Every structure is written in C-alpha cells, then in structure tokens.
Write a protein that holds these residues in place. Sequence first.
Motif, PDB file in Angstrom:
ATOM      1  N   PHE A 154      -0.712  -0.483  33.052  1.00 20.73           N
ATOM      2  CA  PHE A 154      -2.032   0.153  32.343  1.00 20.73           C
ATOM      3  C   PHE A 154      -2.913   0.133  33.779  1.00 20.73           C
ATOM      4  CE2 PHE A 154      -5.963   0.462  30.353  1.00 20.73           C
ATOM      5  CZ  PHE A 154      -6.953  -0.357  31.317  1.00 20.73           C
ATOM      6  N   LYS A 155      -2.963  -0.828  34.579  1.00 18.88           N
ATOM      7  CA  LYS A 155      -3.909  -1.074  35.741  1.00 18.88           C
ATOM      8  C   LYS A 155      -3.149  -0.160  37.097  1.00 18.88           C
ATOM      9  CE  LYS A 155      -6.684  -3.111  37.733  1.00 18.88           C
ATOM     10  NZ  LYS A 155      -8.219  -3.636  38.055  1.00 18.88           N
ATOM     11  N   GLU A 156      -1.827   0.003  36.954  1.00 18.89           N
ATOM     12  CA  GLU A 156      -1.488   0.671  38.039  1.00 18.89           C
ATOM     13  C   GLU A 156      -1.816   1.952  37.963  1.00 18.89           C
ATOM     14  OE1 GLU A 156       3.033   0.590  37.786  1.00 18.89           O
ATOM     15  OE2 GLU A 156       3.096   1.604  39.630  1.00 18.89           O
ATOM     16  N   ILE A 157      -1.796   2.658  36.852  1.00 26.88           N
ATOM     17  CA  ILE A 157      -2.185   4.113  36.509  1.00 26.88           C
ATOM     18  C   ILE A 157      -3.747   4.467  36.890  1.00 26.88           C
ATOM     19  CG2 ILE A 157      -2.343   5.953  34.553  1.00 26.88           C
ATOM     20  CD1 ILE A 157       0.416   5.480  35.368  1.00 26.88           C
ATOM     21  N   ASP A 158      -4.405   3.295  36.656  1.00 30.44           N
ATOM     22  CA  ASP A 158      -5.722   3.326  36.994  1.00 30.44           C
ATOM     23  C   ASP A 158      -6.019   3.388  38.479  1.00 30.44           C
ATOM     24  OD1 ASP A 158      -6.172   3.420  34.364  1.00 30.44           O
ATOM     25  OD2 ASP A 158      -7.705   2.032  34.455  1.00 30.44           O
ATOM     26  N   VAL A 159      -5.727   4.520  39.309  1.00 39.36           N
ATOM     27  CA  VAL A 159      -6.062   4.504  40.725  1.00 39.36           C
ATOM     28  C   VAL A 159      -7.345   4.512  41.045  1.00 39.36           C
ATOM     29  CG1 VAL A 159      -5.458   6.200  42.545  1.00 39.36           C
ATOM     30  CG2 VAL A 159      -4.165   6.323  40.441  1.00 39.36           C
ATOM     31  N   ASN A 160      -8.258   4.659  40.049  1.00 41.61           N
ATOM     32  CA  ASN A 160      -9.846   4.461  40.276  1.00 41.61           C
ATOM     33  C   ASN A 160     -10.083   3.036  40.198  1.00 41.61           C
ATOM     34  OD1 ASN A 160      -9.262   4.065  37.763  1.00 41.61           O
ATOM     35  ND2 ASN A 160     -10.255   5.900  36.823  1.00 41.61           N
ATOM     36  N   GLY A 161      -9.016   2.026  40.120  1.00 43.79           N
ATOM     37  CA  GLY A 161      -9.538   0.582  39.949  1.00 43.79           C
ATOM     38  C   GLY A 161     -10.767   0.217  39.060  1.00 43.79           C
ATOM     39  N   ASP A 162     -10.664   0.848  38.197  1.00 44.51           N
ATOM     40  CA  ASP A 162     -11.642   0.606  36.969  1.00 44.51           C
ATOM     41  C   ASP A 162     -11.073  -0.389  35.843  1.00 44.51           C
ATOM     42  OD1 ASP A 162      -9.877   2.182  35.663  1.00 44.51           O
ATOM     43  OD2 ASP A 162     -11.336   3.947  35.556  1.00 44.51           O
ATOM     44  N   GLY A 163      -9.869  -0.536  35.723  1.00 42.53           N
ATOM     45  CA  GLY A 163      -9.210  -1.245  34.504  1.00 42.53           C
ATOM     46  C   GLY A 163      -9.498  -0.609  33.404  1.00 42.53           C
ATOM     47  N   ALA A 164      -9.958   0.401  33.202  1.00 41.19           N
ATOM     48  CA  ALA A 164     -10.321   0.953  32.019  1.00 41.19           C
ATOM     49  C   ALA A 164      -9.593   2.539  31.750  1.00 41.19           C
ATOM     50  CB  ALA A 164     -11.738   1.150  31.878  1.00 41.19           C
TER      51      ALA A 164
ATOM     52  N   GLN B 159      -8.559  -3.275  30.565  1.00 42.83           N
ATOM     53  CA  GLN B 159      -7.315  -3.875  30.954  1.00 42.83           C
ATOM     54  C   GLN B 159      -7.056  -5.174  29.780  1.00 42.83           C
ATOM     55  OE1 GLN B 159      -8.348  -6.700  34.526  1.00 42.83           O
ATOM     56  NE2 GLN B 159      -9.591  -4.993  34.719  1.00 42.83           N
ATOM     57  N   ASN B 160      -8.340  -6.009  29.716  1.00 45.15           N
ATOM     58  CA  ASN B 160      -8.093  -7.037  28.720  1.00 45.15           C
ATOM     59  C   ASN B 160      -7.500  -6.691  27.304  1.00 45.15           C
ATOM     60  OD1 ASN B 160      -8.927  -9.912  29.500  1.00 45.15           O
ATOM     61  ND2 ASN B 160      -9.596  -9.738  27.463  1.00 45.15           N
ATOM     62  N   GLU B 161      -8.054  -5.533  26.728  1.00 44.49           N
ATOM     63  CA  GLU B 161      -7.910  -4.934  25.407  1.00 44.49           C
ATOM     64  C   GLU B 161      -6.558  -4.623  25.449  1.00 44.49           C
ATOM     65  OE1 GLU B 161     -10.585  -1.856  25.391  1.00 44.49           O
ATOM     66  OE2 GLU B 161     -12.454  -3.580  25.780  1.00 44.49           O
ATOM     67  N   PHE B 162      -6.164  -3.858  26.818  1.00 41.50           N
ATOM     68  CA  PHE B 162      -4.820  -3.256  26.704  1.00 41.50           C
ATOM     69  C   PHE B 162      -3.653  -4.508  26.763  1.00 41.50           C
ATOM     70  CE2 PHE B 162      -2.748   0.704  27.355  1.00 41.50           C
ATOM     71  CZ  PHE B 162      -1.254   0.362  27.751  1.00 41.50           C
ATOM     72  N   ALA B 163      -4.025  -5.396  27.469  1.00 42.69           N
ATOM     73  CA  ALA B 163      -3.013  -6.555  27.406  1.00 42.69           C
ATOM     74  C   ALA B 163      -2.860  -7.308  26.214  1.00 42.69           C
ATOM     75  CB  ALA B 163      -3.630  -7.514  28.544  1.00 42.69           C
ATOM     76  N   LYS B 164      -3.778  -7.527  25.548  1.00 46.82           N
ATOM     77  CA  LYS B 164      -3.773  -8.345  24.221  1.00 46.82           C
ATOM     78  C   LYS B 164      -3.227  -7.289  23.078  1.00 46.82           C
ATOM     79  CE  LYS B 164      -6.406 -11.358  25.980  1.00 46.82           C
ATOM     80  NZ  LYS B 164      -6.256 -12.416  26.850  1.00 46.82           N
ATOM     81  N   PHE B 165      -3.449  -6.069  23.621  1.00 46.83           N
ATOM     82  CA  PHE B 165      -2.736  -5.115  22.506  1.00 46.83           C
ATOM     83  C   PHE B 165      -1.274  -4.814  22.770  1.00 46.83           C
ATOM     84  CE2 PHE B 165      -1.648  -0.308  22.702  1.00 46.83           C
ATOM     85  CZ  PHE B 165      -1.120  -0.351  21.329  1.00 46.83           C
TER      86      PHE B 165
END
Length: 66
Positions: free
Chosen positions: A6-16, A55-61
């Motif tokens: 999830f964070k890898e795909i976020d090339v914008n480094g936004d974690g969202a 990222q948090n929501e994705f991780a817990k999800f």
Amino acid sequence: MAEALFKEIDVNGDGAVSYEEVKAFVSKKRAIKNEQLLQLIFKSIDADGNGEIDQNEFAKFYGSIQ
C-alpha cells in the motif's frame, strides 16, 4: 510483503490511497473497469472512508477479512 504494498504504490509518499488510487493499483495488473466494485471496494478497503484509505486503516484492514 503485506501492507508495505500500500505504501509502496504511494509514490507520492502520502500514505493514503483514494478510490482512484485503488482502481489504478489493480489496473497495473490488468484492464478491468469496475465502477460498482470500485465504489464498494473503496468504502470496504477504507476503514473510515475519508476520501482515501490511510496506511493505518489499510494495515488494520489487511487480513481483517476473517
């Protein structure tokens, strides 16, 4: 390996990752236009559904499909 994707795909480094970002992620594997699945999956993947999945929501999800 799990959530790092999830964070890898976020090339914008936004974690969202918003609905658009989601559809694009899967689009990188093939061409499947799903308006209904995108909307449903968007709110499903997003714990709070606040514009995008953090990222948090994705991780817990991740793996929380028990």
